[PDB]
């Protein structure tokens, strides 16, 4: 019974299940390693059923929920062992939430039919303010300022949070107990986005100081700092490869970083309302890029503040395809509020026709790894599902989910079932205010809660 | 922590070896000894330490690399 024989037993037992489940076996084994080849291999968009989606909204006591991170155990083909931390956690799905109330909360979402169930939480406060006032001494266990982001380790052993307190605290998943605090050691280094490398302990942190920081959670140490962004790095995404992508907000540049090569690729939208009109013979120029998600190791998507969702390919610096005003136009300001004059016509003139109208922003944008479908979010009141073309040159609107009402700060998706039949659950954090701050006016009907939608797959 | 990266890897069966350029990131540290780098390169390449050779290490101005 040498270790090699054990792998043979597990491999033989694994193969028997595939035979029981089912040419088909040969294709299935190839799909197991399709992740290593960084190409899209999950064509299920047409087989999705949005219309029959079971939508539900779960209110949460926390005010203005800021982000959501979900953990899914995955069977490792190399060792045939689940990624669950312990045997108790076998096939248990966890989702972690952060808010500006300085509270971290975990929920169990294993039961697709049932709503998220709270298990444990940890809350911060003024107790955790550092006395030293030095950056390197900002090693307090709990948070003392707004929490902006959360990420769950792929191994299911740790969950990490970061915010404007300029700290990276990593918590134990089971008890939400802080085990290490990693100060950024920068005056303006507020954490804005966190992304775990898929099936790895490497973490990429985007900070307000115009830098990206890399960490090793198993080792609890900082590794490298990346430079090149001219403005705040608002969002970051990563896949199995080390090729993380980021967006610089007002600088209007999307950046792909090759960590091994120590090189960077610069992408710029370069669209002008002026030219879009003559080719037509309302177009809003992009102001900032706020969201990004990597559809593929060789493709990614971005969302701007002008309501433009753009598809990108590494070969081309310019966008390959764009979807202008994806989420529609904001409601026109009321004429009884624009001006104080008695005559109604005078007030209408202040509206200046349609020229004051502005588009919705893409607050959230998430793509399932190596798939042809991605989800976009805003405060329009609906989550839109898009399907990408087979040639990866364009995408179309697959459908919408109107259950969500409020600001979609972050979107996550989890799957369960057999390799043939899967049910997808879309979990989106909903808040009454934008994650970065309180700019946006209050949205009528907005509530703070976790939006859930279970989509069954048939064809 | 310390990171070791290898680039420009050329297989040289004429001398029966592999040639490469080694970049060492050592924040908050002076620099890394040749024996230590040989050990880690041996671990990465799955070869004896005796079969690993390292040289020509210059720390860049400002330190850390």
């Amino acid at each position: 019974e040498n270790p090699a024989d054990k792998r043979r037993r597990l491999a033989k037992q694994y193969l028997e299940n595939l035979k029981s489940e089912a040419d088909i076996i040969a294709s299935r084994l190839k799909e197991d390693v399709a992740e290593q080849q960084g190409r899209v291999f999950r064509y299920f968009g047409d087989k999705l059923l949005i219309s029959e989606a079971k939508q539900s909204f779960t209110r949460v006591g926390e005010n203005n929920l800021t982000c959501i991170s979900c953990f899914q155990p995955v069977l490792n083909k190399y060792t045939f062992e689940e990624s669950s931390n312990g045997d108790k956690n076998k096939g248990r799905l966890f989702a972690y939430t952060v808010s500006k109330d300085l509270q971290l909360t975990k929920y169990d979402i294993t039961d697709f039919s049932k709503r998220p169930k709270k298990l444990k939480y940890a809350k911060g406060g003024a107790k955790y303010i550092p006395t030293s006032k030095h950056e390197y001494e900002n090693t307090t266990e709990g948070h003392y300022d707004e929490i902006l982001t959360v990420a769950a380790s792929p191994d299911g052993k740790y969950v990490v949070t970061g915010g404007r307190d300029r700290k990276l605290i990593v918590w134990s998943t089971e008890s939400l107990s802080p085990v290490k605090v990693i100060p950024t050691k920068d005056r303006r280094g507020e954490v804005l986005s966190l992304a775990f490398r898929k099936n790895s302990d490497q973490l990429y942190a985007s900070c307000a100081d115009f830098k990206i920081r890399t960490y090793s959670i198993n080792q609890f140490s900082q590794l490298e700092i990346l430079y090149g962004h001219h403005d705040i790095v608002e969002d970051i995404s990563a896949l199995a490869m080390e090729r993380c992508v980021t967006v610089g907000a007002r600088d209007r540049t999307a950046m792909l970083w090759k960590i091994p090569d120590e090189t960077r690729l610069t992408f710029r939208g370069g669209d002008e309302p002026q030219k879009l009109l003559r080719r037509w013979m309302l177009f809003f120029c992009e102001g900032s890029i706020d969201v990004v998600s990597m559809v593929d190791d060789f493709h990614f998507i971005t969302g701007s503040d002008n309501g433009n969702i753009c598809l990108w390919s590494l070969a081309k610096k310019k966008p390959i395809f764009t979807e202008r005003i994806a989420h529609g136009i904001l409601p026109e300001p009321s004429f009884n509020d624009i001006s104080g004059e008695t005559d109604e016509e005078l007030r209408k003139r202040q509206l200046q026709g349609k020229k004051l109208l502005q588009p919705f922003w893409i607050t959230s944008l998430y793509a399932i790894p190596y798939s042809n479908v991605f989800i976009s979010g805003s405060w329009s009141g609906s989550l839109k599902v898009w399907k990408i073309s087979d040639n990866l040159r364009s995408f179309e609107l697959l459908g919408e989910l109107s259950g969500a009402k409020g600001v979609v700060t972050k979107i996550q998706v989890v799957e369960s079932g057999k390799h043939g039949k899967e049910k997808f659950r879309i979990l989106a954090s909903i808040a009454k205010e934008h994650r970065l701050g309180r700019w946006i006016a209050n949205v009528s009907g907005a509530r703070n809660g976790i939006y859930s939608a279970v989509i069954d797959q048939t064809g | 922590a310390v990171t070791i990266r290898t680039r420009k890897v050329i297989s040289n069966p004429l001398l029966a070896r592999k040639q490469f350029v080694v970049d060492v990131l050592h924040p908050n540290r002076a620099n890394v000894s040749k024996d230590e780098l040989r050990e880690k390169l041996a671990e990465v390449y799955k070869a004896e330490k005796d079969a690993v050779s390292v040289f020509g290490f210059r720390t860049q101005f400002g330190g850390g690399k």
Binding site: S216, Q219, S221, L223, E242, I259, P260, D261 | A1, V2, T3, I4, R5, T6, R7, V9, I10, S11, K18, F20, K40, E43, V44, Y45
Partner: peptide, 19 residues
């Protein structure tokens, strides 16, 4: 006659972190 087809690099960078 056509020139020999280019051969991809056999070796690629490998990475490790410690202490």
């Amino acid at each position: 006659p056509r020139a020999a087809k280019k051969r991809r690099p056999a070796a690629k960078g490998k990475n490790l972190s410690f202490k």
